[model samples]
Target chain A: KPRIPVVWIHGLECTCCTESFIRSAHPLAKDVILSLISLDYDDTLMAAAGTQAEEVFEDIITQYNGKYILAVEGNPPLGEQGMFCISSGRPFIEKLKRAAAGASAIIAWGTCASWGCVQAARPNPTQATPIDKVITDKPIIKVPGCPPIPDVMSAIITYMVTFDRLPDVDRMGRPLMFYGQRIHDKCYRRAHFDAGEFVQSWDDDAARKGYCLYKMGCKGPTTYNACSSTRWNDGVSFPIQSGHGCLGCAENGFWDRGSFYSRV
Target chain B: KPRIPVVWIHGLECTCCTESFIRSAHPLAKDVILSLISLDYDDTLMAAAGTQAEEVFEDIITQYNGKYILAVEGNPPLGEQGMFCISSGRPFIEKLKRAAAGASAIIAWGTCASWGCVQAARPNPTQATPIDKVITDKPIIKVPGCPPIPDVMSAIITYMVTFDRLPDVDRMGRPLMFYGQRIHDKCYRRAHFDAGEFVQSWDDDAARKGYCLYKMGCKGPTTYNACSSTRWNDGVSFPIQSGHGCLGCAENGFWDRGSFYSRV
Candidate 1:
């Protein structure tokens, strides 16, 4: 059977999504890059430059038409017809719609593409908008995170390649299996929360002992991502384990939501 | 100023250290009986009875000791020299040495005397017992419920009595304030549990829904005693909310460790 081919596109992103996805574990090694996806084009990862890469994007659209995957890594700004973040002399907004038209399925990777992230925090200068806002007529699967859990990246790929269908999604168009529960439900420090034994200060004895971080601005309670369960750097650590509370990077508009310490 | 008088004692295995002094929110009730400790006795919630009601026990113990608290809850066995559970009769063992012995400072209503609970789970041929067991300790408090909520029972009595001494314990000797963490850690699902979103089967959708339990076998995960926060009924919910079924954690002989799913 011919392997499914995936073509990933980029826009106003920080590239964290690509970084995380490249590190995926399921398909293993470069299979995520070579076998699962045809590697037609990715501005950041592909060896092709400028015109060469731009031509590949055009070729994939002409040949595969509705048979390939079109993944958008970040949102586009409508304020200046996407002049704020242009790609190859064309407005990204136009490229997004054009790419989305020929794609068999669409995937919005990272919070930036799924929910406009920090770029759209408050008064978005670029008028950054999520891919869902631009591609109104397609089934879009959103994998959100500042830089989502790498394993989740692999898992999503596995689901797509094995099932040959979109995973079950919540109302927000995000996969339910990965974004189903709040981080707090499965956190390791939950015992302290249950005990009412919280850390009042950053370095308090309780904090040192790894007490509940709710008082320290931890958003584990409000955030929904598999960070605690599927950590980074070979599952070695997550932000919370490193003494930093969850920033709720995956949730919509986290940047303008208020200080991380403010109780939601 | 007259100090509050009360007597405290214990029985059975695994003392659980400070099982007698803790309490939780709403300490007034527990302290009511504790306040009378000056003229009261036994554990923290005065369950005055026996020879004290007959006169001799209270007269010599309280008058001679002058404003002393009497606290005793654990019991002795009638097996082999009353070795299993004892109190009133002969083999109080050291009861003769400790009972009503000028107990002014404060008494502790430890576990054993409180219910003979564990001492009485199943196949309890030895006949384990509770406090009101032996020689009448004065102003006895009956702060029962297994080990009891942290300081709820004790604090309540302490608030009203204005005694430097501990609150009056029941014949079983549990401090009211401390033993009240309740099975509800501000249970986010009391409305649901009561409304019946219970888990019909282990790992059911209801468990995932965080629904009410007419079906899920939760004792209180509902019943109020402070377990939501101050557990053991210690500083947390007895095991029920922690993924295990509550074997009436605060009720004694929970040691049988039987499957709570049996009845549910």
Candidate 2:
């Protein structure tokens, strides 16, 4: 099948989303990147660099104008007119704006692109802005986990490849099938909580007994993702089972919300 | 000042409440029982046994009458005229009623006493009934957890001792100070939930990042307890720190609610 061509772009990001994307275990990350989609111009993945990569980027933009998908990671820094991050001697915001102009749809790949992530936290020196704020005309689908679950990254690609249409999304532009429910809804230790069992301390008997983690500040109840269901690393366990609370990295302005160890 | 006398009773139970009570670290469980309230009769704690212990129970009732507090650790089985549980050669229901008759108030110490817990789960051959259903005259304060948090248990005792009155309670008879909010409301990972970052699997990078566990069937949103604030083991880390979802044991009929591992 002729797959939808995708232009995966990078802005001011840590590239964790790309790292997560390559580890998709279900349909295999390699298959999706190599065969499922015509991933034409990812500067990070392609062997060609410098002038050659720039030439390919321009060719794709002109050849498939208004036809390809633009998957963006990271946010655009509006500080200094988007000069904090540059590509081809110009601000990334300008490059992103240009690419978005002729794209059929846009995929805000992670928290950085969807909600600004850590770079936009508090006194943001770069004044990093989410992609939607930069590309107002395009239809943007936000996969907002900090790095997003790998399977979710691949599945979104597969869905677009198979259906040639955007998956159902929530008000925030997140795919409904993955972001519909909170992690708490599908947790394994729910029974312990319902049974009024909880781990009081690191060395307590409850901790030894594997009780509920709500007391220690788990964000499972409010977070939305398919991690608990799809799982990661070929399906073993999530953070809760291994012992620790959810950090809620996908939400907007998470860094400035409050202390990570303190209760909300 | 003469401390308020307390008569702790047991029925169909595992004695876990007594175990938890002894482990109370705040104000020391021993102080709450020995100094604050004159815990005159606790079958598990009292050194007296058999006939002598039975005599002590009778004397306390006559001595305090409408002044003592009745602390029940488990439920009374109504099946076969309360034959499911027998104490000192008599049905537990009769003993429970007789003791509750002149008590100023009743404290349902565990889910077994407050909500019938596992004893009341479907196919309850014992017909174990919660204290409220069996006792009509007294105000019942439910300190329900499978084995209630030790500090909370002791705090209730201290509050009753110092105030000589019942602590403020919610609609469900849970103390407002401890059960006023859902665990999720005060969870530490709330930022992650708001941010939407979640651990997709047990060993995934998200898990290592301490993302939200909402996708793992956590019951923190539905449960109300002091675990998040007071925590367990002298304000040490709670379950979420150890990485597990809440079981919602403080809620009514937790056992019969449904699968402990599935979303509510």
Candidate 3:
């Protein structure tokens, strides 16, 4: 099998997606990067910088055209003539379009690339837009979250490389396997809710005894992600397990979805 | 029954707990505030601020003495002479003690007051501290959560006012009925675990089949909370069902526990 070149780019983001990917804890995570694909031009991870990195980016799109993966970690701002976010001395949108023209597939990494996240929150002065909306030609796989689960990131990359096909996905371009269910459906406190037992205060007796958080406006019911079963930090905890509720960061417009403490 | 006076104060934290309290969606939420408790000095929700705010609390302490409730949000910083967060032109620590002196009981609203939360995280520049330590004399009820569920806010208040006493509490001062179980104990995916089925990767076949995410690093086994049973947003859903793991926000040292993805 041909080893595909992977081009990971950034726009208006904090490099958090890159951070999560680097933390892919699975043993296979190392192999996925060392041998599975040639990660060519990552703004955050690659040691190559300045024109040298830009040269590598132009080289990959030129030589390997249509045989590489374009991984986007943030969204492009359409407003202000796309001046809000820049890349390679040009607007990120320009670089994005240039990359998309020759890419075989694209991966919208994290909430910013997939759903615009906080950048697109109400009164979005920069007009930041999700990658899918801009690059209509390519088949985009959206791996969303504030920064999606690390293993999920590695697994998705491996699945694509190993099977030589995009995994089945939901309407939102999220893989069916990871984004198939709502967080509420698999929650452990479900019985408490069904039983009408709930914690009524921050540290009340019911809270310590394990009561429900629905009355607190948890977003689990409407949000979708793999945190519940997948857990975080390698199955150690999620928001609910830590005594908080889901922020619904995986869903569209989560930042704009109203207060984290309000019902969805 | 005579209405009880309650003085709610703020420290080094956001107003999220108050926001949640205001959103209490239960039918009785309105009644709990309207008649049950004479909420006199809330920094965020009350119209009183400036000198007027200080005067209100002073009045409650003088008139009600040990009969009033002391609700504290956030925590007080001990560093820099407790200058990190101040209330009424004084360090919050002083205000806390002043209130604690004449209070019948104290309520630690959210994680800040209960467990110190972000303010008390390692290398806490301000040396922010939980309320229990400073005011050991009062029967402090610790209600934890970045923001405790809304109904929890009202319910605990109503219970105290109606019964004229604090509800049963656990060692940590949380209500036993609400904080009693581990999220993993009641997870819906238990059957999949018992069957030795697990999702090895995101979007893999097993993931789509709704297999257990133990292999994916779920933290349900160790963390405790009612999101699984009571669910979020009025029994809508929890994190596990949303395809993610718990963050263990409710636990004592969750932030200090390291990565949210590392295995516990």
Candidate 4:
């Protein structure tokens, strides 16, 4: 095996986090996954399957017990005794804890695990819950967002692999370096915001002037995410830059909040 | 109310396509959507609710019939008569046709509507289908990608609003301005490819030195998109720049392709 194994597990949700992860632009996810640390287990990417995959999963947990980092994407559905999502016969909740039992730390990837996402929307049916609620014992590093920014996700892993320790986290267990401030803090539209310039509504002259979206229900002033500085799709553009305001996907209970376009 | 009226509709899919649309950089998505075209109807962004919302949707079709632009995102699921995705007590297919019948032109936004995306994967459970399959009566512009580039999406709209006509398209119906070139033709890593320098695997010295991923499962050579020239997140980074090879999300049948890591 390679040095410092990382066990990435999936639960109840779309696999968009992995999609975003694969697009990491900095150290390159390929390099990190291939050379840096042994990506010991991940059903989505690993080539091995059936019993061979199971054996590798078991070996990594058994051999590197309490040594490997556990990266969890999507939240486990606790509905119907966790019957909502099944993985290799057992409930994903069981699999999650089994891995978490021997992991050195954890990463709550995306809003799915960081905060209950759309699956956990109002009057949740499947009871898709966040990771902190279920796996309360470990150091859960929450990388919150619809899908956490790629480079931020990669850099966290790179730091973990490089230092053999957790990155400095805030009170919310989020990496301070990335989630330290509001998106509005360093926003390019900051000048517009301070000058009281705002888009009156869709297609207005203020928009042509590239006015701030603060009055248009933009959550940039309140949400704590790195989209402004770090950006998405390899720093191509973020929600605000493209035009729409942030939905505060990273904040707790962001799903149950009022309209994304309504003033907060 | 505005210069041009555009109707945007959604069906069976996540709204990531619109997410990308809002991230346009140059003219800015806000300017294109606001000052350039009157986004007459959109449940996601419009402030109207319930019956009032339906009126806006109805009025746009009636008042601007055969004059407005129709932007379609996501796919219509035809399984059991489009029951898979319902909108206002009716199938999206019915809604799509009603709008398409009157629109001067249509834009198939994202891989979903353009190629049926994840909902149409493999066994074709829901029979989620693409736009060309249903709307054969009009000039359809296909902007394909899991989520298309923001600037490209906005540019198409800006061109349409400015010129009052569809932008030039390739044989496949994608805008020639954006999808005319294969990503490989202008990739930053093209030098490495010509020199035969390649990353043997992840984190290899070849990768450390910034080599090409042609030996990897890169689809840049075959895929057509403006990612290389436009870059993502306002020219910050893209898939290759970050270390992962292109998965060709813009190409037809990209989801069903052989392993993304496999050398093509």
Candidate 5:
């Protein structure tokens, strides 16, 4: 009968995931932090600071053991006990491991936590590791994205609260509802792909005239996520709509895949 | 054994489909025409003309009689006995029907013959119909396209010769090997689609920088064909690579869908 409190943690990341999550229009920012879950702690968005913040996290861990949700915003570096980034005088890896021990479910907030992201790109200096790698036994939900859509973040939280458990996941522990099909399947520009019209050069007549971007190195066909239909920024536009090809940020090792401008 | 001889026919078209077929590079047009199937007839590509051409067609049909492959390009105007576009004195429909009768299998080349192209669009005075609509109870293979990519045309022919029978076909009689998937599945832009990147304004930064064009009326998500991977013009760029969206010309009733700019 009690509300499940959700604790948020971050390791190595640019915090774009946090920016996108806070922009949720479905549950809205107000609903997410205020009404969706207890939202006990998030360093970036929360008001508490320093040792007091650590105390708030400790209290939640002790007070709601086996009932709280442990969510990680990014991956943690493993080279030096995660000396790369620390919060409250402790390695994020330590906090994640300690917090996960008493949590009911774990959520990997973005690609960094789900698949290591740019931090784990080849020749990684800090040896960043995904969250699921550290918390293997618990029911972990991966919401992979360079910066996940705002609605998707809220939807995952809402689904967990409404259903009292994580939704059915796919092979990689991604929620099936949002990550089942490729964005290409539901795209509005599908006709151009079928007709074989494509943008030859950036801002060329074909591009300006509105043509398919398969030749422009877009990754929409191979990657699977809800950005096309779900959209972002108050449903204003996604990266593609704004004239940028998908960087395949949600996929594993996206940074090592090669140049974004060079079509694979 | 003996090499199978094939007779290719045409009805209403721009002759571009023939151009695509003769330019096949995979098996090579020479192999498809000379080594694979005995390319006995193609009104557009062949040098014969006038009454001599008519005599050669009748002679081939009589000599082969249920032994040869009959491939038809373009559609037929069923109303008024296909009077809208006539080849020679008689209607092309009459010629097509006559050729199909004696062949063991019939292959419909281009969308005109497989799905009915512009001639079949609304306000159609000719009542243009696909080959299947007029010829029933025949082993028909629909290779639909405004002018299907060159390799696709040759591949189907080469496959038939090597396998000694038609390849598995979909419900619409399109060869499953080539028409089995949407262009989006293998499109380079797929990552952008999954990431929810889209091109809104034609010349915007995104469009100029090569973003997904699902919003620009690309039909790759819905249309089934192999132009993306197989390509055209001797394994060169396809329409999508050339900066145009797929028109879904291969799909049935494409003309009724609207201009290439309109979404189906």
Candidate 6:
């Protein structure tokens, strides 16, 4: 099969999504970038800079046109005449709109792009907006997470590349295969929760005994993702295993939720 | 109609369960105690004390043997020859056994009586054990919670008294009508959760905006109870609505699960 052409774009972001993507262990980054997809223009990853990078970006857009994939990281700031983020000597939203205009399908790569994460958190002075709100004409798939799990990011693209079809997604445009279940459903410490045992305080006897973290503000029960089962760092351990609760980074607007340490 | 006899007993526990029970709002404590069922013996509620109270307990068991309902609040310690809790010069377990032997059914009130709770948490010097573990012969209906929702407690007894039969229970022996759904399923803040809006800090703008508290370690999604739907204090508000996350007080072993302030 011919490798699918991809134009990875950046907007308002910390680039953690890119970091997580490159760390994918299941289908290593080498396989994804070198074999499965022809990742043509990513300002952060591509070797070229300035005019050379712009030349390649335009070349891919012209060659593939409506056949290429537009994968967007982070969201677009719409305040102050789009002055919050500038890329390629112009507002990133303008570049995003142009690329989205000719893409086969758009992939909102992180919570930033999918739900306007921290950038759009309360007050939202820059008026950061999610991709869906801005691009109403296209079908956009949202892979929401603070950065999304590396394996999950790789798997989504792999499914799209291998099958030539979008994976079944939920009402929120999230792939069901990955975001279908809540972390609490598959947590390892579920037994302790069911047994009604919990750690009362940090460094308490119960904490030392490895009790459930529900009371400590773990969002595993309400947050949906593959972390508990698929795990992080090659299935070694997730947050809960490290004696900390899930931060619910995958769900939308986690930064706006109550303190990471307070119980809901 | 003659009220059904109900024998309420205490073991190794604070009287919080009774306190919650007496404050029921659905049917009201007066209606439940004065009309629905004859609350014949509750060491904390009854006016009789010492030998007189013991006489009433024995009297109810003999007069309405296999007819009265045994509602046990808190668990009994089996350690130290069941000496951790004593009533009338004997291990409370002895009294529990005697009561269970003649009761038509058993209602394990509070997490203490349903899942051993804090008393049964790690090290468990007292070796406190739930009612079901001690009395396995009769069908046990568990209404687990730190103190349990008052309405739930009243509803359970009311259902039994009005119908002359035990209310339908789930696999875990909790009445289905109240324990069938999770707090998350009916939470008012569920829309915020679905939209990925959450309160990040205790006093953050999101908290003031009434955003979802899933990130704050709420156990509503994993907990099965009627607090979200029925609420507390006559449905005025629940923990989540009051700007606090659910501690999953109605769930089993919530105390030893982890820090109540941490995420699951």
User: After superposing candidate 2, which stretches have Cα over 4 Å from the reference?
Assistant: A1-264
What is the overall TM-score of model 4 with all chains considered together?
Answer: 0.52
lDDT of 1 by residue, A150-181 (tens): 88888887888889889999988889988987
Residue A200 in model 5: lDDT: 79
The interface RMSD values of the models, given in order, are 9.6, 11.9, 8.0, 14.6, 11.8, 13.9
In candidate 2, the second chain superimposes onto the true chain B with a TM-score of: 0.95
Error of 1 at A151 (Å): 1.1
**Model 1 per-residue lDDT tens digits across residues B1-264:** 544544444455454423444433334334444444443433333466666542545464656575455555456665676755355654664653355457543333444554566666678777765545544544444444445555544454455465544553333344444443345433434434434446677667776654444344555442335544334432333454445545455554554645555442
By lDDT rank, best first, the candidates go: 4, 6, 2, 3, 5, 1
**Clashing residue pair totals per candidate (backbone < 3 A):** 113, 51, 79, 12, 46, 45
* Fnat of every candidate, listed in order: 0.00, 0.00, 0.36, 0.07, 0.00, 0.00
lDDT for each residue of candidate 3 in B1-264, tens digit (9 for 90 to 100) = 667888888888888888878877663556767877788788777787788877887888999998898899888999989888876567888988998999989999888888888867788889988888788888988877767767677778877766877989989998765666677778777656655878777888887676777777777777766666555555445676776767776777678887766666
Listed per candidate, the RMSD to the true structure in angstroms reads: 14.2, 15.4, 17.2, 20.8, 19.3, 20.3
| TM-score for chain B of each model, two decimals | 0.56, 0.95, 0.91, 0.96, 0.92, 0.96
Report DockQ per prediction, comma-separated.
Answer: 0.02, 0.02, 0.14, 0.04, 0.02, 0.01
Chain A only TM-scores, each candidate in turn: 0.96, 0.95, 0.96, 0.96, 0.95, 0.97
**Residue B203, model 4: Cα distance from true site in angstroms:** 33
Could you tell me which 10 consecutive residues in candidate 3 chain A have the lowest summed lDDT? A24-33
Could you tell me how far off, in angstroms, the CA of residue B22 lies in candidate 6 after the best superposition?
A: 63
The TM-scores, one per candidate, come to 0.55, 0.52, 0.54, 0.52, 0.52, 0.51
Q: Provide the lowest-lDDT 10-residue window in model 3 chain B.
A: B228-237
Residues B1-264 of candidate 6: C-alpha lDDT, one tens digit per residue? 677888988898888898988788778898777777788998887899998987898889999998988889888998999888888788999999999999888888889999988888888889898888878889998988888888888877777766878889899998888887778765656656766878888989778756678889888878998876566765555798788988888888787788767886
Worst 10 residues of 6 chain B by lDDT: B228-237
Alpha carbon lDDT of residue A18, candidate 3? 88
Model 1 TM-score (2 dp): 0.55
**Candidate 4 whole-model C-alpha lDDT, 0 to 1:** 0.85
